[PDB]
């Protein structure tokens, strides 16, 4: 389908079954469907803890670098995954959400102590 | 029925949904298919009748099941 405009994006395509999410890190044209045609599958991501309490993420770092060079954008979840991986800096929103969680738990603890 | 079989097979002329007029053999011991009644008709030729290449599906629309 001849798309006007658009641009490559490295993003998560949701596969899996109901109640069982699973993501394929695919470098795809942004206008293309979420789970549709993709230029290249750069990795995978299982968001459910496995028997060892792990969320397995596989990042084809070489091709990810090649596509970032070739001019592909990064969706926010992919940016946060890379930030956790240390391939990127931690996302400003990850940091701010961590601080928000710290403040929220602090309020909860303070109220529990008071009551 | 064609020889050697001998009987009086019950049949009905019906105008199918496709606009065609066909002859459907009515199975079962006894029926009450009167004129203007709506029936469902499936394939399967009655072997002893030449040209009667359909059968009324019992229990559907106005063709009640065979009384025991």
């Amino acid at each position: 389908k001849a798309y006007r405009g658009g641009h490559l994006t490295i993003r998560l395509a949701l596969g899996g079954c109901t109640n069982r999410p699973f993501y394929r890190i695919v470098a795809a044209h942004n206008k293309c469907p979420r789970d549709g045609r993709f230029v290249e599958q750069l990795g995978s991501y299982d968001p459910l803890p496995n028997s060892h309490g792990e969320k397995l993420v596989a990042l084809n770092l070489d091709r990810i670098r090649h596509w970032i060079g070739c001019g592909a954008h990064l969706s926010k979840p992919m940016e946060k995954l890379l930030g956790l991986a240390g391939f990127f800096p931690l996302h400003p929103m990850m940091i701010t959400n961590a601080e928000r969680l710290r403040r929220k738990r602090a309020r909860e603890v303070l109220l529990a102590s008071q009551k | 029925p064609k020889k050697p079989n001998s009987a009086n097979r019950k049949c009905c002329r019906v105008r199918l949904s496709t606009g065609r007029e066909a002859v459907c053999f009515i199975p079962g011991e006894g029926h009450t298919l009167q004129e203007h009644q709506i029936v469902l008709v499936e394939g399967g030729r009655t072997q002893d009748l030449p040209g009667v290449k359909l059968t009324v599906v019992r229990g559907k629309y106005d063709c009640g099941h065979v009384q025991k």
Partner: protein, 416 residues
Amino acid sequence: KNKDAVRRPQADPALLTPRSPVVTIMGHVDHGKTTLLDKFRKTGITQHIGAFLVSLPSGEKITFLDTPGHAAFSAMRARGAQVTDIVVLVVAADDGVMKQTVESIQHAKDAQVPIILAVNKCDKAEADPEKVKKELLAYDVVCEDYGGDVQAVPVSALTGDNLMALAEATVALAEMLELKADPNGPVEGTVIESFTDKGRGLVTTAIIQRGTLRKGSVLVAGKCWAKVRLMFDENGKTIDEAYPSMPVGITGWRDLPSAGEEILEVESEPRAREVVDWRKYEQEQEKGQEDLKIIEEKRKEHKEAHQSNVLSVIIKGDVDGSVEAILNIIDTYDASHECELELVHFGVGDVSANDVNLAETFDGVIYGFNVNAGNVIQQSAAKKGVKIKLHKIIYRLVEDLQEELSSRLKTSWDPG
């Protein structure tokens, strides 16, 4: 295993709660019942039994069932009498007590419903309410004037005179009756009319009698079931609830229930489907017994042996009540000897390709009562030689039917 869903046992005295009254305005043709209803609602032949939830100046709410007065709609009048709990008969003293007036009186007697006489057109000359009451004496409606219980109210629906007294009398009789019903639990009601809207599917205008109806309920009536999809009023505005004695139009009907059928709420869609299957099986057993007797007769005959002027008619109506009325008029045919009348197919809705095909197959005529036939249907009918006859009035359609019968021959059948 019997899976039928039956009406719940009569409500407990503690569970009982006051409810509105249900009033049917019966009477013979053109005695101003429609005018009286319009005046009460603050807003030339009736052909539909219409339910309206009116609010009186006192703040009370009353459900009025305006019924047709024509002789043809005896079924409609009987259904209205059965469903209602008060019959505000309307009689024009100038015209006097008539055949349909007496019919309504008998229906009220059967239903065991208090009757209130409203003398209509009392403004006009020659109006003799005393004579009206006298004549009613013969038909057992003993007005309070002649030492009785029936309240007679002189009114002039056109001029709106004494209607306040009529409403006051109705409210007083309602309070005396002390009508109450359980507002909670599975809903119970009766279908007042059923039809097919090209937008809203199969709809049924019913009157609730118990419990409260709400979107998402599962109802069963006759061989039909529904998941209540849209509850609407006379003006179509959606209503979130339908308390007892509330007229409500319910959408979401998988099949078009017969008029007057009982509607009962069941637990779930699978339970409703089980109930419908069981009822269809019961009907199948009954028809099977009939067919078994006929077949046994035929088979005995066969074993012992072994030892034209016909009018085919398709009927299409706007509502099931209208279709039933036309069917009764047809069944009153008695001149089969000179010409036979055959009813190929009856239904509710605009003339359809299936109706046209039946007409073509049986050389029939389509009679559409208050229904349309799109240009596509008209073109197909012209192509196939079918004749469509769209009538908006029952007696006009009956006249046309008689004319066709004579053309086939005048026809000896008198509708009466």
